[PDB]
């Protein structure tokens, strides 16, 4: 049923001006709290450090963090919830010199200042309770 | 792998029933994949949950019920018999007073009946696992 298989793992490189586009839909109603996770990894292996971790608990909150030297760092939480129950969404993550800008359905929704340089990213993983129709990294 | 996830099946339970689940997490424990098993009062996903069993692999287990649309008293355990990167066998037995949850033959968790197990009409298995076996015993 999901057009693209989930978990979805792709080799990627990022710098200022790069955009990561993700089109998908949660697999459950918001009452059931499905999650979405997007991780920008330093290496191809899943256990590698995470430069940018973006986790949505649909209908509840968004958590952002990094995993450095194998440990989760300072968690950032947002109760901003532009995602709509049972709807397809479009997620756009832009790389700016100082931060990532996260757009949901074309609206500025979240930001996260760079901890690790985006130039250290080698892989992007999209996983948890979503079906996926589109994944793209601009070059 | 052979059974799709989310996996949903019509079911009925009473004393002596066993729900057998064979599967494997989709990620290493460092990435905190989840497993969720919900015993529902109706076929619809938004229905009440008699028994909610949620594993955050390598971290914790949470159990609860959802009654009249609201999550009730959460039960938490840091017991972790699940092994990183391994296939597991989960066996949920229905006893007169509680569910007994066995992992790879070890009695690992228990949950006293809030709603009678006879109210269950559906079982849903979802989140970050591949599923090789699902069975509800009868008679």
Keywords:
seven-stranded antiparallel beta sheet, Galectin_CRD (chain A), 53% strand, 139 residues, homodimer, five-stranded antiparallel beta sheet
State which percent range the strand residues of chain A make up: over 45%
Q: What's the helical proportion of residues of chain A?
A: under 10%
Largest interface by residue count? Answer: A-B, 16 and 14 residues
Quaternary organisation of the protein chains: homodimer
Largest sheet of chain A: 7 strands, antiparallel
Supply Rg of chain A. 14 Å
What's the shape of chain A?
globular
Annotation, overall tally of beta strands of chain A: 12
Could you say what the CATH topology of chain A is called?
Answer: Jelly Rolls
How many H/I helical runs of chain A?
0
**Overall number of domains of chain A:** 1
CATH architecture of chain A: Sandwich
> What is the helix/strand order of chain A?
EEEEEEEEEEEE
The separation of the N and C termini of chain A measures 29 Å
PDB class: sugar binding protein
Keywords: Fab, galectin-10, autocrystallizing, crystal solubilisation, sugar binding protein
Assembly: dimeric
Entry title: Structure of galectin-10 in complex with the Fab fragment of a Charcot-Leyden crystal solubilizing antibody, 1D11
């Amino acid at each position: 049923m999901s057009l693209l298989p989930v978990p979805y793992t792709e080799a990627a490189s990022l710098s200022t001006g790069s955009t990561v586009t993700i089109k998908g839909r949660p697999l459950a109603c918001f009452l059931n709290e499905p999650y979405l996770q997007v991780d920008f990894h330093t290496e191809m292996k899943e256990e590698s450090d995470i430069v940018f971790h973006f986790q949505v608990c649909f209908g509840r909150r968004v958590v952002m963090n990094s995993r450095e030297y194998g440990a989760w760092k300072q968690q950032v939480e947002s109760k901003n919830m532009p995602f709509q129950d049972g709807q397809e969404f479009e997620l756009s993550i832009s790389v700016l010199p100082d931060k990532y800008q996260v757009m949901v359905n074309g609206q500025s929704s979240y930001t996260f200042d760079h901890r690790i340089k985006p130039e250290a990213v080698k892989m992007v993983q999209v996983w948890r309770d979503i079906s996926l129709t589109k994944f793209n990294v601009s070059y």
